[PDB]
Design a protein around this ligand. Structure first.
Ligand SMILES: *C(=S)c1cc(C(=O)S)c[n+]([C@@H]2O[C@H](COP(=O)(O)O)[C@@H](O)[C@H]2O)c1
Ligand code: NI
Length: 425
């Protein structure tokens, strides 16, 4: 059974045993939009739950447009050219318009990344700046939620007369789905906010997980925080496995987002009849699989269909390596995941990116992990609570020998962009 797993910029061609392997779990077919940019134009004229963007923008003196950073494969020019043309038609000059990269707590985008994200012409024609989550002085305090999270949001967005956000609706291991409100919290929120919102009091709950909005405390809270900042207009898209846009939603930050989620829920779920002992997955290739930090998403994404004590085999290119210095420091400070969890469950201290180690700890309570990558040497991966294995085919052979002849293999080529589920019926 030959399959191409997502892997860096290339894919990875794997051959899995026919007798042991279930049919691959894939996004359901939906027709790509032939001309998604023209659809964005139409949706800006007739949006969901808001005035047309042209009428909203007229008389506004300044605009701030939130865009995702490199880790999200948003086809930004498709969304931005319509927005920028409408703002021009509304009378805003280009100098009135700021594009703000909603990094969350990620490192800033590089000059080359801005070109990759936005296109060269857009990137040199409008001001493009990065959010810095550890610079509290660049944020404005908006209040504290009923659950005690202070809302600190980037001042360039707070001060803008017209607030716009763009993004991509995909499953997310903490917030259920990306998009909508998440461009604000945490996209332009300070560590003072994010350290609490990404704390164990949120992440240890079972529905802080892929595909859950209802019942997910993470989503309740980032929606509440985004409502405190406000957002006048969003444009969000969904993408199929080949990265073609399959839907566009525009308008009210909540109503448009929920319509996009309703769409993605019709295609993202891939069901199996029972969990299996071996799950082969990816980190969705470039650009998500740049770091081990992000590749944890492939591991959490596989959890619903792995049996307790099973093995997840993941392939990810890891072209940028492990991730932030702070994320890397946690492995040095806590040799075992149990000890790491004891430390963070005390709430005495907060470290940038600790939330992803908390998610890796959740994976490792349920499953072994075999990790296939050339971006990081085996000795380095072995210190990150995964077993480096030279090839996916070898890793699967090893797991099948360990579990015995009844074991089955599932495979998820697009990794965390699929929502695998067990349907016992
Ligand atoms: C979601 S919890 C999230 C977390 C971070 C952290 O650093 S923590 C960063 N981001 C970035 O915010 C933008 C919007 O997120 P979405 O999940 O794509 O809707 C995007 O640039 C993310 O990289 C998000
Ligand atoms: Ni986050």
């Amino acid at each position: 059974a030959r399959v191409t797993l997502d892997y860096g910029k290339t894919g990875l061609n794997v051959d899995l045993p026919d007798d042991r392997t279930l049919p691959p779990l894939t996004i359901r077919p939906a027709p790509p939009l032939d001309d998604p940019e023209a659809e964005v134009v139409r949706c800006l004229a007739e949006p969901i739950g808001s005035p047309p963007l042209l009428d909203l923008a007229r008389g506004k003196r300044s605009a701030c447009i939130l865009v995702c950073d490199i880790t999200r494969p948003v086809p930004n020019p498709v969304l931005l050219r319509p927005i920028l043309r409408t703002l021009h038609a509304a009378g805003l000059a280009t100098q009135d318009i700021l594009i703000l990269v909603a990094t969350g707590l990620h490192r800033p985008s590089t000059p080359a990344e801005k070109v990759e994200m936005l296109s060269e012409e857009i990137a040199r024609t409008y001001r493009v700046e990065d959010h810095y989550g550890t610079r509290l002085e660049e944020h404005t305090y908006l209040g504290t939620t009923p659950n005690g999270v202070p809302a600190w949001i980037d001042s360039r967005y707070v001060q803008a007369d017209l607030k716009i956000a763009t993004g991509l609706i995909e499953p997310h291991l903490m917030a259920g789905y990306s998009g909508g409100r998440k461009l604000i919290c945490p996209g332009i929120a300070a560590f003072e906010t994010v350290k609490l919102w990404h704390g164990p009091r949120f992440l240890e709950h079972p529905l802080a997980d892929c595909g859950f909005l209802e019942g997910n405390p993470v989503h309740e809270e980032n929606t509440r925080i985004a409502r405190m900042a406000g957002c006048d207009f969003i444009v969000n898209v969904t993408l199929d496995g080949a990265r073609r846009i399959t839907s566009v939603v525009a308008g009210d930050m909540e109503q448009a987002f929920l319509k996009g989620v309703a769409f993605v829920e019709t295609v993202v779920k891939a069901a199996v009849p029972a969990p299996v002992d071996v799950v082969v997955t990816s980190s969705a290739g470039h650009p998500l699989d740049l770091t081990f930090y992000q590749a944890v998403k492939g591991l959490t994404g596989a959890l619903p269909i792995v049996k307790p004590g099973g093995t997840i085999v993941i392939a990810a290119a890891l072209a940028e390596g492990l991730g932030s210095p702070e994320f890397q420091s946690l492995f040095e400070e806590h040799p075992t995941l149990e000890g790491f969890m004891e430390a963070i469950l005390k709430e005495e201290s907060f470290t940038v990116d600790q939330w992803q180690l908390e998610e890796l700890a959740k994976v490792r309570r349920k499953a072994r992990v075999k990790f296939v990558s050339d971006g990081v040497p085996a000795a380095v991966l072995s210190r990150c609570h995964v077993e480096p294995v030279a090839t996916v085919e070898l890793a699967v052979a090893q797991a099948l020998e360990q579990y015995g002849p009844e074991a089955r293999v599932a495979v998820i080529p697009k990794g965390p962009y699929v929502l695998p589920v067990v349907d016992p019926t």
